Design a protein around this ligand. Structure first.
Ligand SMILES: NC(=O)c1ccc[n+]([C@@H]2O[C@H](COP(=O)([O-])OP(=O)(O)OC[C@H]3O[C@@H](n4cnc5c(N)ncnc54)[C@H](OP(=O)(O)O)[C@@H]3O)[C@@H](O)[C@H]2O)c1
Ligand SMILES: NC(=O)c1ccc[n+]([C@@H]2O[C@H](COP(=O)([O-])OP(=O)(O)OC[C@H]3O[C@@H](n4cnc5c(N)ncnc54)[C@H](OP(=O)(O)O)[C@@H]3O)[C@@H](O)[C@H]2O)c1
Lengths: 653, 653
């Protein structure tokens, strides 16, 4: 079977991250069988040694000589660590010389929580492991590839990273979806700069049969974990919604309502006459729909669900002691039975198998085979190859350019509203937007949340009249946007419209170096992380906080490009736009599954080509008015199908 | 080099259309080298015999025995002929038994004219050759593939067929672009029905080095023909624009103005004091920018350009004798010099090489190699594989769902306008639209163009009040829509808004048969041609006529899908929507290159999933109002960047 591989990649040097098991292990195996010298990078030394011995033994069997020179390993390499990425390149370069193929395969599952329960550091770690590492390794390897005249960068993305002009929601996986979308976006925008010497593509497999999805006897896989999370998330969401519902119609504090959960007894809560109807109906549901052998049928929660519930409540402005669940009676194992988890795990697998046009998943060998043949194609760059797939899953087309003004019914709902505007760099857009809300649509007040004092002063001066009339309030957020939103809520009340623009502009730096250059001026590994911080994480932090604020409409705004903007700014802007679509679509679906009525849409200020951009002051004026219309179209509340249309969507100004 | 191919497709039977040269010839060659038995279909017997002898000789060299049983030919097979497609299947089935791989490779360049100069029969021929043939062959071969448990349908589409959620304009190639887009759309929508047994994908190469693009010594290729057409089209467009411009400010008839072109002397026209300034300035331009060795620098036109100019004028309502150019002095060869054509051909190739991220084109061998490896992948269906490419060309994202009402300035322009509504089946949409234009936006009159008398009576009854007040006029078009538009122009005046809805609904028929069934009920080859006639050609015919009507705004409306609609209707509706986007985007760009100020946009009534569709009477009412807003957003005229935004675009209702 390996006879079709001999000579296919002979003379090539390949670097495979996550090369000790899964898809990566197979790509490394098949590349070695194809004649390539391979370096396998992963954390565990033992797994890396096992795979190396397995590949070397196989190479010897087909006829190869000095097989130890063909398969090298790089243990203790965590792709989320920059230092480890620098040590990997040096170890690979010393071992084999220049790298021809960079296989950015490593990809952690990530946080596996809804955005509202996703720690900011967890989101950051996934971006570093899955996305920032891809740029870091390309940045260290592309100068030597351009010098020798050839090279290939392959990013192992996913079907759940979406496609060129459509976003795919991936609930409970926003960090993951974004990182996969960014890997694809990198191939799409860097191809024009990396060519003619270097090819850059993404592979986006659909679900694959293997240990990641199926799991081992010792450790549960993606399906079993997703099954356990479905059950745990269901308990968290139901408890949270019932507490928010009861709080509306009950005069007791959230603290007093949470105190009713403390005996942690489903039966005692159901028959408690002093408890609100929403909590009693919830207890009845927990015992009625539950498994009698599961302690989740007799106990309300466990220490883990209690901590997530507490953080949701704290993040949503409710005042509760941090020790409220300290003496919570711990339910006896199992909280959810193996029967409940298996039924849920079977539903996940059956649902996926149903979505697949071919009603079958490829093996890791199959995906690696399609990839190794794909790597032989020298005439394709900036593409996303789908080695498996074709799924019935819903996609959200992005890039609607043709739109108009929202209805007068929706506009009259803006009268007397509280507007939050977040930004710094886009002073013109922020000034015009604050004025449109206050002067045209009679909003009660605008809270201008900036990053710095210099930004606050610039906005206060531009809006001097509204500042004088107590209509425009300014808050300096710094790198504490969550505390800044809390300040705005406490002092000026909860918002209706929320317009989140980036604080920072896109950098004006080269994306590739000249053939004989040192690449010293080229966008660094640290600057690429900052780009993701300022242009992705910024929006995620605001969305995480605003998704717990009832009655809010959030517009996530992407960077601005002009006829003046550098070609590098166009690339980076298009990279962001695409990557943030994955986030916007994912959180849009997650928001449906919450108690809070919250709309989240994306407004794109960036365009693919310079030819589309305005060229005169009249064409600029049309653009700025189009921006206001786009924001109003997504921020004006829907007065009591239309909800599906007005969420996780993105329009191009 | 062929050692990597041995056994890759061993035991497989492949049918390759256009298998005697180009990409198809190489796919057949490489599939045979891979162990497949191949049938090559094309028109010329000699070319087919040459290729067969070449492949058989090669097979013998690598070791194969009885090579004559491995390579068969099917001469005199024109894919545009249904009879020839039936004879091909029977000849292939008798020769080898069941076909595993259907390679729908044949693809004619087509008419190679702007839509306004494209004969309706030429457009039809391209659809038959390039698109209808793909369904026809699949329809005859899929029953036997489903029976044996396996099969593969591969449509050789193009980069110029666009992508899942973005259309790519291909000026002067609308028939071609549409056929390529339809080949991709077929793979996208039929995969769910054809699985698990049958895979259906498209390949979409970017430009490929070969005889199609480069040409032979005897016959010019795509580039040289495109160079010649650029020059000929430039002469046609400039002459046409100057005649339309002069007609505006001159009281002479179009007949009298065309009479000034009859001496066919550039110098005599320039210095003719009696000639209009636009024609004199045109003559000066023809000699000033021309090559002195070309007769196009001293003569205005030739018999070929004169006939195209005459048909444009006739199709635009100008009255001229059919014999007006009968005695036109024929210019001496060359009309355009080899120098002019070569310069133009070099500009085409350099422009394409510039657009390519890799700045190189693959060979036909390279594309066939990537395809033959791709065919080995058993786990992918409903996809478009790009074996080459990555181009800087502009794309038009489709699927904008979020939009609103147009500006009050644009709406007041509708006051006193003449509206043309084209349709039959969608009585509710036509009644509500006619009423919105007349009652809400004060249009002077609505001309309701239907297909049949039964349709006219249904509309006249629904709009009884407007019919009584002389506000609603009805015309029965039958299969003579061009003559029906002429009638409306002569009798009621030229239109402002033009809303083109399909006359016919989508069929309610199976798209695949049961494993053991005869497939007798499945959408026939003739019904698929009718689907293209009613749902594609219908719009093309209207657009071709309306693109010559100054001040018109054309909205091309795609079929309606509901929560009631069959799953087969959803597939076919999504097939149309995608295929028509290629047309809409192409004609939008061509319209910029014309004298007439004409806007052309697409309004989609169809949606991908049933889940998106309304479920109650209130959700239906929102949908119908969204339809009116969408049509107004694209039909309200732009009062004197914004033109680029308002053209070749498509929104989803
Ligand atoms: N499986 C699917 O269904 C599927 C579908 C679409 C896309 N993908 C993508 O395909 C790629 C490979 O996935 P897979 O299914 O093969 O996953 P996997 O089984 O989790 O990958 C295991 C490999 O990754 C390494 N690894 C894990 N965490 C790492 C880290 N922090 N740093 C470095 N190496 C690390 C492992 O070794 P150590 O743990 O010792 O480091 C091992 O070598 C990923 O990018 C994933 O997103 C997978
Ligand atoms: N070349 C490119 O740059 C490019 C790029 C993207 C996509 N494609 C697509 O790739 C496919 C093959 O293109 P190519 O470049 O190989 O074209 P090509 O060189 O024109 O194809 C020649 C082959 O097609 C046959 N053929 C032509 N007209 C036919 C007809 N009416 N019926 C049956 N066979 C016919 C020819 O034989 P006879 O004339 O004797 O019949 C010969 O076998 C097409 O579908 C095309 O759209 C090509």
């Amino acid at each position: 079977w390996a006879e079709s591989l001999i000579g296919l990649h002979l003379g090539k040097v390949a670097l495979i991250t996550g090369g000790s098991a899964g898809i990566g292990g197979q790509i490394g195996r098949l590349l070695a069988l194809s004649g390539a010298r391979v370096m396998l990078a992963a954390r565990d030394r033992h797994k890396l040694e096992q795979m190396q011995a397995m590949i070397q033994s196989e190479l010897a069997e087909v006829g190869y000589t000095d097989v130890e020179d063909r398969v090298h390993i790089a243990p203790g390499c965590d792709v989320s660590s920059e230092a480890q990425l620098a040590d990997l390149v040096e170890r690979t370069l010393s071992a084999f010389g220049t790298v021809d193929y960079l296989i950015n395969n490593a990809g952690i599952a990530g946080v596996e929580e809804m955005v509202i329960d996703m720690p900011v550091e967890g989101w950051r770690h996934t971006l570093f492991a899955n996305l920032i590492s891809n740029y870091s390794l390309m940045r260290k390897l592309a100068p030597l590839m351009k010098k020798q005249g050839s090279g290939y960068i392959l990013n192992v993305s996913s079907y759940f990273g979406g496609e060129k002009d459509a976003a795919i929601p991936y609930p409970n996986r926003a960090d993951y979806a974004v990182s996969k979308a960014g890997q694809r976006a990198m191939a799409e925008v860097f191809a024009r700069f990396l060519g003619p010497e270097i090819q850059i593509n993404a592979i986006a497999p659909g679900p694959v049969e293997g240990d990641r999805l199926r799991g081992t006897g010792e450790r549960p896989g993606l399906f079993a974990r997703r099954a356990r999370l479905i059950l745990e998330n269901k308990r968290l969401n139901e408890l949270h919604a019932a507490l928010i519902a009861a709080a509306r119609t009950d005069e007791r504090s959230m603290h007093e309502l949470v105190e009713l959960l403390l005996p942690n007894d489903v039966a005692a809560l159901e028959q408690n006459p002093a408890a609100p109807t929403a909590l009693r109906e919830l207890a009845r549901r927990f015992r009625s729909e539950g498994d009698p052998a599961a302690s989740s049928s007799s106990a309300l929660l466990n220490r883990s669900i209690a901590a997530k519930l507490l953080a949701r409540l704290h993040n949503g402005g409710y005042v509760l002691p941090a020790d409220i669940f300290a003496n919570l009676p711990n339910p006896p194992d199992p909280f959810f039975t193996r029967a409940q988890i298996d039924r849920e795990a079977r539903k996940v697998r059956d649902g996926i198998m149903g979505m697949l046009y071919l009603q079958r998943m490829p093996t890791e060998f199959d995906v690696a085979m399609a990839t190794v043949y794909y790597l032989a194609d020298r005439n394709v760059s900036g593409e996303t190859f789908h080695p498996s797939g074709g799924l019935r899953y819903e996609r959200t087309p992005t890039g609607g350019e043709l739109f108009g003004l929202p209805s007068p019914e929706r506009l009259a709902e803006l009268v007397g509203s509280t507007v939050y505007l977040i930004g710094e760099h886009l002073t013109e857009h922020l000034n015009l937007l604050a004025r449109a809300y206050l002067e045209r649509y009679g909003a009660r007040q605008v809270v201008m949340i900036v990053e710095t004092e210099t930004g606050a002063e610039t906005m206060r001066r531009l809006l001097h009249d509204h500042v004088e009339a107590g209509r425009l309030m300014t808050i300096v957020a710094g790198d504490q946007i969550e505390a800044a939103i809390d300040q705005a809520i406490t002092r000026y009340g909860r918002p209706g419209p929320v317009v989140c623009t980036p604080f920072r502009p896109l950098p004006t730096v080269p994306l590739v170096g000249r053939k004989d250059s040192d690449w010293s001026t080229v966008l660094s590994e640290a600057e690429f992380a900052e780009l993701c911080e300022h242009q992705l994480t910024h929006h995620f932090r605001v969305a995480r906080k605003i998704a717990l604020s009832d009655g809010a409409s959030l517009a996530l705004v992407t960077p601005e490009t002009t006829a003046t903007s550098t070609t590098e700014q166009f690339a980076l802007a298009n990279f962001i736009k695409t990557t943030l679509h994955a986030f916007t679509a994912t959180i849009g679906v997650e928001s449906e599954r919450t108690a809070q009525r919250i709309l989240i849409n994306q407004v794109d200020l960036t365009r693919r080509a310079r030819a589309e951009e305005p060229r005169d002051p009249h064409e600029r004026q049309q653009e700025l008015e189009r921006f206001i219309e786009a924001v109003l179209l997504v921020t004006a509340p829907l007065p009591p199908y239309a909800g599906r249309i007005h969420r996780g969507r993105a329009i191009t100004v």
